[PDB]
């Protein structure tokens, strides 16, 4: 892997959509938190070794979907992850698919359950960079923790960002805008105030947004992206060795996981290299 400054949309080869012999294990989990008893899936990379430490990426489904959608026949994201890790395009990581369904949970308020229940449950059981899952242990491993999502799950992602910068450094909002404001500048300012309160430097948080040029999400995302670009908090470029903000728009892509899985193929290899604990040249 090498960073590009303006990475372009490129679908995974069609071969990546079929099962790979080097298949990561997908574990169905059940936990109880502030929204009652709920499930999530945990993708473990092929060769997962609990004596090693893995990057972790939490990835939210869209409206009318559930914690099983992303690894279902409708999406098959695990095949793409399996092929990309096997081919060395993507460093091995843990991918979690939770749900905003259940109890008092909504796409907007999921971050509260994420903080209190989901991180402690997943990262007590599986080997992340978290030494412990106290607030301190989670915060001290933030550079190795990412959140993303599609549509309503992209809205989850923006609310995770504004409320969880202490816990998460890498954000992948796909086809979803941040509902918090009466203008694009209010949206940008809300994110800027979150960043100000966090104390973090511009080198300590990263946003790879994406959508399709034929995805309705573009209408509200693009103005938000333009307003954020104007902030001093963001240096626009996909080269995260130099800046921290990018917006990939896939030509012709519609509001459909068939396209959105390719955004994760394009974007997820960009994550978790800044202050990484390996000696890599990107």
Q: Is 189 helix (H, G, I), strand (E, B) or coil?
A: helix
Experimental approach: X-ray
* 248, HSE (Cβ side, Cα atoms, 13 Å): 29
Rounded Cα distance between 277 and 206, Å, is: 18
Burial profile 37-59: b = 16 or more Cβ within 10 angstroms, e = fewer:
ebbbbbbbbeebeeeeebbbbbb
| Partners of 268 in the β-ladder | none
Summary count for the chain: helices (H), strands (E)? 8, 8
Domain 1-282 is classified in which CATH homologous superfamily?
Alpha/Beta hydrolase fold, catalytic domain (3.40.50.1820)
Written as six digits, the tokens of 12 are: 């995974």
Closest-CA residue to 55 (of 29, 31, 86, 85)? 85
Specified resolution (Å): 1.8
Report the greatest alpha carbon distance in the chain. Answer: 50
What is the residue-wise DSSP string for 198-249? HT--TTS-EEEEEEETTSTTHHHHHHHHHHHHHSTT--BBS-TTT--EEEEE
């Amino acid at each position: 892997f090498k960073y590009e400054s303006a990475v372009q949309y490129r679908p995974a080869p069609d071969s990546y959509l079929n099962p790979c012999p080097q298949a990561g294990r997908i574990v169905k989990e059940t936990y109880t938190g502030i929204n009652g008893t709920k499930s999530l899936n945990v993708y473990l990379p092929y060769g997962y070794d609990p004596n090693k430490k893995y990057n972790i990426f939490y990835l939210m489904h869209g409206g009318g979907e559930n914690e099983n959608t992303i690894f279902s026949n409708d999406v098959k994201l695990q095949n793409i992850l399996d092929h990309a890790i096997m081919n060395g395009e993507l460093e091995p990581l843990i991918v979690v698919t939770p749900t905003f369904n259940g109890g008092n949970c909504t796409a907007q308020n999921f971050y509260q359950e994420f903080r209190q229940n989901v991180i402690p449950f997943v990262e007590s059981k599986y080997s992340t960079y978290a030494e412990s899952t106290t607030p301190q242990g989670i915060a001290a491993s933030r550079m190795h923790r990412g959140f993303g999502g599609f549509s309503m799950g992209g809205l989850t992602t923006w609310y995770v960002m504004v409320n969880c910068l202490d816990y998460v450094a890498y954000f992948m909002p796909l086809s979803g805008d941040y509902w918090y404001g009466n203008s694009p500048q209010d949206k940008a300012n809300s994110i800027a105030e979150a960043i100000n309160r966090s104390g973090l430097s511009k080198r300590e948080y990263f946003v790879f947004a994406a959508t399709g040029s034929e995805d309705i999400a573009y209408a509200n995302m693009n103005p938000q992206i333009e307003a954020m670009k104007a902030l001093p908090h963001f240096d626009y470029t996909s080269d995260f060795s130099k800046g921290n903000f990018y917006f990939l728009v896939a030509p012709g892509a519609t509001h459909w996981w068939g396209y959105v899985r390719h955004y994760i193929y394009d974007a997820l290899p960009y994550f978790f290299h800044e202050l990484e604990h390996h000696h890599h040249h990107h």
